[PDB]
Write a protein that binds this ligand. Sequence first.
Ligand SMILES: Nc1ncnc2c1ncn2[C@@H]1O[C@H](COP(=O)(O)OP(=O)(O)OP(=O)(O)O)[C@@H](O)[C@H]1O
Ligand SMILES: Nc1ncnc2c1ncn2[C@@H]1O[C@H](COP(=O)(O)OP(=O)(O)OP(=O)(O)O)[C@@H](O)[C@H]1O
Lengths: 384, 90, 228, 889, 393
Amino acid sequence: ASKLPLVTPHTQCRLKLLKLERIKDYLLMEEEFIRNQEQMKPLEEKQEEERSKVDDLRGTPMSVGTLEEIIDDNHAIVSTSVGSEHYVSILSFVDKDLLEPGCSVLLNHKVHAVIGVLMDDTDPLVTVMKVEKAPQETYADIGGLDNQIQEIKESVELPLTHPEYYEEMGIKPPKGVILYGPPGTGKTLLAKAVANQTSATFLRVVGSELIQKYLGDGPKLVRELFRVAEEHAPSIVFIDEIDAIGTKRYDSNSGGEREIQRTMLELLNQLDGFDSRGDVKVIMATNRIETLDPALIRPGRIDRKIEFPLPDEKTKKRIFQIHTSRMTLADDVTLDDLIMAKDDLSGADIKAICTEAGLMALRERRMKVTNEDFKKSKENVLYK
Amino acid sequence: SEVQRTMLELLNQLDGFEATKNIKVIMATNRIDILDSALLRPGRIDRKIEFPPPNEEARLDILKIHSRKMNLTRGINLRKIAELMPGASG
Amino acid sequence: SEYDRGVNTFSPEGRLFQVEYAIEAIKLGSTAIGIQTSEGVCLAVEKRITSPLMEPSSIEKIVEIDAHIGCAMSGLIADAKTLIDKARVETQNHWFTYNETMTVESVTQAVSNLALQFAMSRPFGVALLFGGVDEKGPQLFHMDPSGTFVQCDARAIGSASEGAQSSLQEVYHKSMTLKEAIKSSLIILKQVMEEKLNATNIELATVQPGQNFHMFTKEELEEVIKDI
Amino acid sequence: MEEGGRDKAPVQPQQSPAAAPGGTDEKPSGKERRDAGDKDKEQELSEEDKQLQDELEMLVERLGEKDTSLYRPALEELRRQIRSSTTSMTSVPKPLKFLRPHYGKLKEIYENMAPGENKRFAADIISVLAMTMSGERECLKYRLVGSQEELASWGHEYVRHLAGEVAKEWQELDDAEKVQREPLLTLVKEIVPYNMAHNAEHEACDLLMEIEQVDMLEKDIDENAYAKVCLYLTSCVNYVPEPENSALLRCALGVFRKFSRFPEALRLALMLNDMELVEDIFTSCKDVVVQKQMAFMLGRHGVFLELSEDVEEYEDLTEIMSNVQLNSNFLALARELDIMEPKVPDDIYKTHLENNRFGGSGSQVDSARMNLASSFVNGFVNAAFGQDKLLTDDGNKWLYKNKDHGMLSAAASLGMILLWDVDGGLTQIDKYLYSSEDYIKSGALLACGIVNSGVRNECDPALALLSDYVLHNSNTMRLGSIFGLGLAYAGSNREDVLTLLLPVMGDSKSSMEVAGVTALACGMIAVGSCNGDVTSTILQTIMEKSETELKDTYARWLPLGLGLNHLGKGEAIEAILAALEVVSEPFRSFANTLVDVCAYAGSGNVLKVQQLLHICSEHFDSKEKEEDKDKKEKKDKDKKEAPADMGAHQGVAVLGIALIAMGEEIGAEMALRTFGHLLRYGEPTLRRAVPLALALISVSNPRLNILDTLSKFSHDADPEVSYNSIFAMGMVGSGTNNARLAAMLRQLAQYHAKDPNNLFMVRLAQGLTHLGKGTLTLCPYHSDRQLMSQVAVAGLLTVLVSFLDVRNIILGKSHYVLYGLVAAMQPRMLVTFDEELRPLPVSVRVGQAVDVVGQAGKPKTITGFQTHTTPVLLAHGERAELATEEFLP
Amino acid sequence: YSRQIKQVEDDIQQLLKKINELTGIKESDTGLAPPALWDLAADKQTLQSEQPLQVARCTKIINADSEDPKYIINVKQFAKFVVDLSDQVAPTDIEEGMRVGVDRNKYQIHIPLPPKIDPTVTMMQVEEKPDVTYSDVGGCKEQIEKLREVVETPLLHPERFVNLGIEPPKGVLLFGPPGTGKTLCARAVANRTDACFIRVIGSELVQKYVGEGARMVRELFEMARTKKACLIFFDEIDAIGGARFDDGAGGDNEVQRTMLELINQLDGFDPRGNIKVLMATNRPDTLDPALMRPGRLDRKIEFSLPDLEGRTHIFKIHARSMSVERDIRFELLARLCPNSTGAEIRSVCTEAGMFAIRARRKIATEKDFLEAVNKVIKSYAKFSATPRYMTYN
Ligand SMILES: Nc1ncnc2c1ncn2[C@@H]1O[C@H](COP(=O)(O)OP(=O)(O)OP(=O)(O)O)[C@@H](O)[C@H]1O
Ligand SMILES: Nc1ncnc2c1ncn2[C@@H]1O[C@H](COP(=O)(O)OP(=O)(O)OP(=O)(O)O)[C@@H](O)[C@H]1O
């Protein structure tokens, strides 16, 4: 791997022909010398029989140890599974580069010497925290807003798709972004839309499960959450309903709001860690933003704040056209009457109305909706 | 109230973010006025269903399906027994 | 906590911090400059217009205390309104009782007396610059929301006050004429205003030993703008 | 799908041409007018590059093949009237009508005859009708015709005019992007006779556009990075008049003159120096041209300006060339002394304070060889114009204590002190010329040589003091009596004092160490095409070294005197003239590996690369030619210093997978010496790769080689985090890598970085990448640095003071007529963009901006902002005159 | 030529992809490196790991004994018994609280005894310095110099202090406005240092159990005192201890023990000596007076909000990179944002650059900076994090 980066000419030219001929001749002498090394110096065969001798020197089982300290000169102390640690030697082929404390190592069964390092067999919570596939429709699905969409593309999507503009700007793209507003306006979905659009690794967990039953486990949890976030890729991390951590109290926690405060100070450290952060981007969403500690919201930790207003009626009819598109509607229905049917209605409300109208039509095995279906839908959905 | 918070993380997990279909959630409780406003957005919950206390026909039917499995006697008139109890519960 | 700012709490060390917060709040206002010369006293403020809709005539900071004393305004204007009204009525009843015109120091001391009095529950977000003439000649007094009034020959208040004060230290001396002082004040104002100087972008007033409180030299200041 | 009904072009241009016997005969109106309609409809619709499936370029040809098979390949009665209106439809969509081997029959449709001209109906095309046609023609048909016989009947003159018009077509269609395809097509046709197309396109590009003389210029230099053997020779020499004829830039005449001088001829840039004397345009750019002429890459030019003392400003031009016109020394007293650099920092030695309390007791270091390192403690820090007034007292009493070689070492390290201060440095060295010790007096003579290195002073104080010691009775004043003089008079290649040191080879005295370093000093003045130096060395080699060939002191220094200075010239006959008379015995053919690549400093000769590898890779020679295989790999480190940053990638790839991967004594002893020369800035690839073999010393080898691998690992740029590893190497170096043989070596590595934390250029990438000197002092340093007792007794003659050809580090400067401007500059990363778009930025890291001198470093291309109207060179080189004006900035 | 461009390069680069793979026949590690370098010592120097050196597992010293050695050894929990180990080292390296490599039947001494500590604190050293300097921190110059003569001349030449016979100060607190302040200048300090720079974030010290934080504080002080001089950084000490305020049922004792034991460790009974520590928090009024005692908190660096000159200087600092029409009015920009913090100012310049790159522009203007500042300081003015924290309450 890592041969040479060159995509400059990309044409019928000696600036490509020369490069290709020189590199293929370099591969030619590489091939000729490696042919030299197993022809007049085969030893036995020197490619896999050496591997065979190592594998023979490798013990059949794995006395798996846990690493706790390092000594440079081909030995160290390792702790056994039963807990009786040993100061065993290492192998010459123990590939002394990916050794880290707390890691699984293949040891011998007799002398227990460090034979090799063990690849981790995945991790439980990396599977839980990582969203696998794209959820749903892209930015054509929202409708109505058309302003915060451009902003969040500028702050998140634009650094990835156009990593050139900031270079002639000589400037850094914004880091921390709050989404806020009345609930049901489309924050955690706008989250779904941007999750669909992006190609980077995506992380999602809600603040509600940041409470935990002991002391310090919350801050520790945030620690390896961000560790997983850093160790994979350029990543976008999404936390939803952060205000719950400050609003809803519980009894399952060992400590009260004190341990909550400790978790808060840890995450305030984590957003502005003086250690090298890198290309990890942060997206938040919270309806009750006023209850949060304002020092979390600061520039350097949070750069953008985006309000989500209640939808306008011209946006309401856009939502009507969007959501009722794939369903069969009769001519007797009218969206315009249903626009102002409620003074204070949300984007969840219209979807709930149309789904209830769909199931009400399914009650009588009917394919098309009628006006009375919405007329009976409105009080079922909203009015209780 | 931890039942409600579990419904928070579960229901926001099953909203498009998941990929494995045929998974749904059922909640049984009482006194719906006490639960938080978070589950009260109409998009959160698809259906809410009330169970009334049993009336005379329901009491008689439940009495039948429980009296199926004892050594009864010919001639009972379980209607009188059902109307004797003023519908405690099932 | 909220009990810390109840009414009257000094500091962990030092004087009351809320009046110090009024001191830092006074920088959130348009600047003003005042020069006291033997030939006369000159005052100038910035209108700070935001749009061509409203008339600049209603954008009023400099007012007349009486026929020989004027003053500027800074910070919260509605806070200044009460103090200016009280100063006007106390000057008028002092003339009524004392059949004469007073010194600027009396008015300055009176507004300093009202400044501490807590309308209550906070100091007033306003710093005034009294200017005029009395029996001992030209007078210019500076006042702060803490109430410590003091005399000054040249002063700049409001936002950007210290840079203007530094330029005043650079250029002001004793034997400057009134025209020279006005020209220097306009020069400094030009280098401290963010927008280009216009006919109604600023406002000027002056007090002479001979003439009364001048009528803001309206439509004559374009002569002293265009020449420079 | 939608097809049929609207297929009018697959019907009426399908029925009419299929009846070509029915059209050309018995229907002349049809054959003329319908073909004219097909021409002027396709030429406007199917003849612009829009998509593959055009309406006639791909659509009508589906049946149109049988419309084309007999329309006009066979009529046998052709006239004038049916060559404009019958070579009318079938000429256009032919590369997609026919298959891939249409190149042989490429003539048969379009190249037969056009209606008057190709551009008559090629004007509505982008690439296909004429541009792809010309590309295929010049690629294959003109190639095969012009392979042996260019002008037979037709395939030259029409081809010449076609080349002439496409030379303007590459700009007229769009003068943005495919103008760079004009050198593409110019190189594709007549590759070996590139001059024949270049003279054709030269005046055409000269009349093309004044501001278009720059992208073709840089495309030319990118192709001029490497090419075939005669190809770069003709391309550069035809490239030289380009920045002069149309463009009046004329300041890249120096670097182009350099590129054209040594590969093509001997006195080619001497003619270009005469042309520099001709182009007496405004003197700021003239003075900046002659700024390069001594003290950046090459000198020896003090006789071409005193034409009857008539050149305008002669006395200032001479003060600039001579490097005696302190533009880096006044700089030295004004830039870093006044900001960050004191005369006596002396800290990296004193930094060894933290490690004493790790592992237990401290102060265990009690050897004497470590005092040698103490020399560099006052030596290496005293570069960039420091001073040690009695701060060399630690060296003074040690110069009166032990170690004759150490006395010589300290006295030679004194010349590092006052580097380039010829006027003040002699007064500080004088006090030692009067010593009762030959080692101290010899080290003071070497110090006088070191102070003059790269500075041509009118008083010749190096020659005038060292002359009297060259033939001296002993060796301290005899051997070391000449090394500084060659260092003083290297670039100023004066043959007069060279003749004075010629009879030292003819001394015929016992000079087993001395005659070898004499060949070093003579070659330091001049090597390669040197008439007396070659003859004297080869005759002395037969006279003594032929009967005894035992130790590397003999035949690793006399081969260095043959052709190291003229390694840029690649005619390879200097290899022939120096080896073919000494190919007698294998230890005398041992030097043939030197002489072969002593014409091969930098080029593309992968064929010459592979012949140095395949014929002698390992062969298991068993201690007879193994050292010669080491030298061949030691001659593989060059040719890769500036391979357009390309062969270095494969070079570090093959070195990792061959020598250290599965090798022998070749890969066990001097494998890392290639890295010692390859890079000089330091990148994390080798910065981790070397300590794999260095920190694990693997002392089975004579570990001084691995120590030498560790020592030359400090080749990188001066400021680094790399301190910590070589400090941690000090941790393992306390007990292991004992003080008896390594203590001077490890400490030398840390101070190699922290010399003047700046002031370093022998990388041979000057200006942007160009060559010059950088080897005549560097190559001796590692050649005698194997592992053995050479570097201890005999190495101390040189290893302290081997390479002093450093020529500054910083470039960002002002250099006004008052020489004190502070004009706003803007540091930026090295250039990454070669041919992308017209408003390409030169760099990317645009954040940090000073206006005063700083660190130029290796990977930077500082140009500056504000448009200060600096039209002087705009090509960097640290002495821009900044002829300030106001072009509306 | 243009659509024909893709016919020359492929014929050689696919061949390149063949021979590079054919050379790439030493891979598929899953616990290895390239075996030409991984198993580069796959010769007998593998067998000498077996027969010369034997297991020599860890141990724990318990008690000494008179005359002949006969020391008492713990394994970890296996057995607790008395042997004499061997004779290849002099019996003066044995002290209680140490770990020897000891066999199961021969009980060889092997190597001298290193201390055992948590791997977490070994990980906790950062060994990386961020690329921030003492030049790019402007607005707090007197705070800068006050921290210059805390972490320099003790680390540099001590002959001045010895000559004047003055012990240098140890306990230094640096503090400032919330959010803008101590953290980035602490990175600068870690940039300019030479010895180790032990990070401590206060939130991590709390554990599931009780009193473990005391154990890791003891361990970190021990590994610090292994060095001659080493720097200790403390962040957000407010959570790691406020005050002893216990009433009725125990409240927040679990952290109280940790803060009090570090207070015992800093002062009294042969202290760390040459160890420099420093702490920074978010609210100072809530700290304990015993932690506030001098000898642990000698210097009191307090950063405030810059008046105008610091604001102009930071405007210089962050904005030497963006394109402008030469002339600027940065001082009037600073006058426009009187009570504004440094990261807010960097956010203002960031959003000005974002407004410039909105449609097609390449250089922001003065009105672009106006459009930055009005939608930063007086459109996001609702929260701003300042007012309840300038009183630090
Ligand atoms: N503008 C809108 N148009 C249509 N549906 C909307 C709109 N805004 C929100 N919704 C609905 O809101 C529901 C939840 O979406 P999202 O995860 O983005 O959170 P939210 O709307 O902010 O509300 P909540 O906080 O209650 O989850 C979805 O069922 C979606 O249909
Ligand atoms: N003097 C200064 N010059 C330039 N930038 C400064 C200066 N002081 C602070 N900053 C800015 O402060 C921001 C971060 O502040 P920092 O984190 O160091 O402060 P703090 O008080 O430790 O708060 P917190 O760690 O809780 O965010 C950076 O964006 C940095 O640019």
